[PDB]
Amino acid sequence: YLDRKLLTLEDKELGSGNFGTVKKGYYQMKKVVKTVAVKILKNEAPALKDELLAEANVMQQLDNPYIVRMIGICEAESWMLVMEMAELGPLNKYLQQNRHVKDKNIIELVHQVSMGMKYLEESNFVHRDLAARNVLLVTQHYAKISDFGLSKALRADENYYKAQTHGKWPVKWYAPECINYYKFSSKSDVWSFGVLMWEAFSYGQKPYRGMKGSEVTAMLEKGERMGCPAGCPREMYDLMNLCWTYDVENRPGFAAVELRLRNYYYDVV
């Protein structure tokens, strides 16, 4: 566990989630001080603590340039998950506020995400919340995946995790087998990645605007998909549609997705 006396938190906050705050902080290391982001658990007054610790347990096992690194867990006034700071914050919000960012730049960023998800797939972890809000920018040209609170280490003898009843909020990023069978796999992360790309090339607009989850589900069952974002490169829209392959077996893994991106990034460059 980290030493609370070595951590300073900034009084102003970055955002409030479900349910807690994220604050910027500074953690004194063996000699330099490191800038951190700290997820702080709201707990006016048990098992919310367990959730944060599980989240920490996953991040501890992950080591990759395109995933947020955990520094550690701190037990103090509140329970806290201390991470290396990605200064520019969430990809969706950054693109909302930086429409000047060019298609080539967006391609670079989503490609980096595919590289981190290839690693995750190889480590047999499912993310289960892969969306533009959970990609963070270190700089305008370097993205990392964040938010492992829903993530699961897959059993040695299976390539999916079985959940129970989901609410409405996450539906727009879920593959059909998630909606209907509560089955989560690297292939379901690939589906969510297609939505993440549609988000990124829409400069952080919401997918399926104005539709209820039930309507999204119906649309997908009819073979319909979101249309091409204004200005979006045709080949990136083509890749989105491949990620939205209905049948889990025929949908690509992250190896294949990463190759298509690398190749198109090269073409554009």
Ligand SMILES: Cc1nn(-c2ccnc(Nc3ccc4c(c3)c(C)c(C)n4C)n2)cc1CN1CC(O)C1
């Ligand atoms: C688990 C978690 N880590 N984490 C984090 C990790 C490393 N760096 C950062 N940097 C950062 C920088 C600026 C930020 C943010 C995060 C956030 C959430 C906002 C609103 N800004 C301006 N955040 C943010 C979160 C909360 N998730 C981001 C999703 O949007 C909710």
